[PDB]
Design a protein around this ligand. Sequence first.
Ligand code: M2P
Ligand code: CA
Ligand code: CA
Ligand code: CL
Lengths: 324, 325
Amino acid sequence: TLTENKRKSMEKLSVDGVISALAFDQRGALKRMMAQHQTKEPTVEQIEELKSLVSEELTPFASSILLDPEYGLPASRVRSEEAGLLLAYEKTGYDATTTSRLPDCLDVWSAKRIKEAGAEAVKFLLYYDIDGDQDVNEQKKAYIERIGSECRAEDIPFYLEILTYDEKIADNASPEFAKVKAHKVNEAMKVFSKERFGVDVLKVEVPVNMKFVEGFADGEVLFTKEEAAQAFRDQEASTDLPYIYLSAGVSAKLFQDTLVFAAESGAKFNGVLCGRATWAGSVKVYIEEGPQAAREWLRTEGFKNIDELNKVLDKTASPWTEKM
Amino acid sequence: ITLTENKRKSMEKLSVDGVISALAFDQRGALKRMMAQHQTKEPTVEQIEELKSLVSEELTPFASSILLDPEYGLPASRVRSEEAGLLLAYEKTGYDATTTSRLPDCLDVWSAKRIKEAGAEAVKFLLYYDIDGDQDVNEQKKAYIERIGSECRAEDIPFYLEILTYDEKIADNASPEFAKVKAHKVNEAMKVFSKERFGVDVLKVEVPVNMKFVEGFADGEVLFTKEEAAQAFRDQEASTDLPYIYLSAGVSAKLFQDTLVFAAESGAKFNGVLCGRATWAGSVKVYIEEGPQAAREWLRTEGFKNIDELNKVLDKTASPWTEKM
Ligand SMILES: O=P(O)(O)OC[C@@H](O)[C@@H](O)[C@H](O)[C@H](O)COP(=O)(O)O
Ligand SMILES: [Ca+2]
Ligand SMILES: [Ca+2]
Ligand SMILES: [Cl-]
């Protein structure tokens, strides 16, 4: 059940019920990427410009774009007229001296202001360990309730992004984390699918680390294909809400092969909010060679990434208009 | 200007014939400290919760509603008169005295949804505001109130915004220095948060004057004539079209009551009060020292007399909030 306005906004973010969205709200993550190629700290102008370049060159090929309000408003104004807009509402990153990873809204923003800035959706990122401290998770659930209520009042779709972790596992790329990932992802989805959180779309990880799956793995194999497939069916069984996948910065090819595997396995996912798998290469070029070189990278390599993704989405994603 | 069906029903449960006679008892750290004064042991959760229940049970039959804190006040809320509405506070108490920003912060495991689920007919939130303060601080404060106002719209529960004014550069808001600017701080803060975007249903505000410096009411130095004081009330009435009620903290019951009369004479159309310590402060010493049954007897006699006298004054001074609809 969508209100008239939430439905209109979902339509502006989608094509034929599929979300082929471009993600560039990266801030903390962007900065870590930029640091690989220069000693100097990134300036505001540089961040704004790279976002604007990606927006201008690639949104003609996306149903919508996700940007951050801190650096991304100029970029939002040069997006394709056919592409919708999501704006991020959370502060970037988390405190690495504690395990709680508590969420925090941008200080001078509200769901109302995000709508006033021309967004068709509010996006919020929550770090969640289903097995973690219960009082921490109580605080997290309470915080999402507030945001869900705001979005109900402002009549703007609520896109909740969940990134999972384990309080006691330092590296979520490790085999140790791979072994519990499906549990973390699928049980978190089940919680945040509860009516009281007011989510319209879940933006989630695939429930497997594909690098440890038979046929995809280049080293140790932790899972057969059938086991991986069952993780995807468990994910589909964990919600009746629309959901879309994030890339997590894997290779464009691995992400594409994952979508194919997801669909074959029985996951009726409704699109992607994909960023780095598409544009990651532009960061090095932008820093070393500058804006025009980056533009040319975007028109060629960038386009090729997003075009190949779109072809894969076309044959793998399911429309959210059927979740209704 | 307008109320949904459920917000209107809730407002009616909070009032009597359009007048809010609300009993305030969301005190936390403040209440605990009073308690200490009368006894040796650190006050217990048991004690803090019990006094609230006694006050709630014995005095809410004579109030239109009661304001409680979710942290200690839920048991007290459940023994309130069935004819009394409930407001629950949503803010963390106090402020960082090392800084001047006094930023607002909601209780960590509460939401407007949870407040409604706990049986409340209103969400109360206390904001400290200096209209003349740091513009980025105030931008952050405005964003925060927008969020809560949106929550309350979605959960369809009245939003009561309490504003307490201060100056970043004046330590004592009881000083003559603050008195000279208080009308400015109060009235301009009301103008800000009366804007539609903040979603406020009722403002809970200070009287726009320190009556202790007004001619006729002052024991010492006199800063204002009666006419100057009255103009401040008329300016306050003109600062909002929303319902608003007065908070009493800072003055004696007798002076508060005299203030209500002066307010009405001056042309203020206030819609009630949120009155606390005046009404039950006396039981606190009796509860700690003579036990619970003694407090119940104090509340039934002195306690009733206090709230009854207040109600008699409200009857001749307050205006119904339905005349603002
Ligand atoms: O840490 P930051 O600086 O806030 O940004 C990265 C982080 O939010 C990620 O979760 C992305 O927002 C999301 O995954 C979409 O990007 P991709 O994963 O598709 O590349
Ligand atoms: Ca449901
Ligand atoms: Ca399902
Ligand atoms: Cl207190």
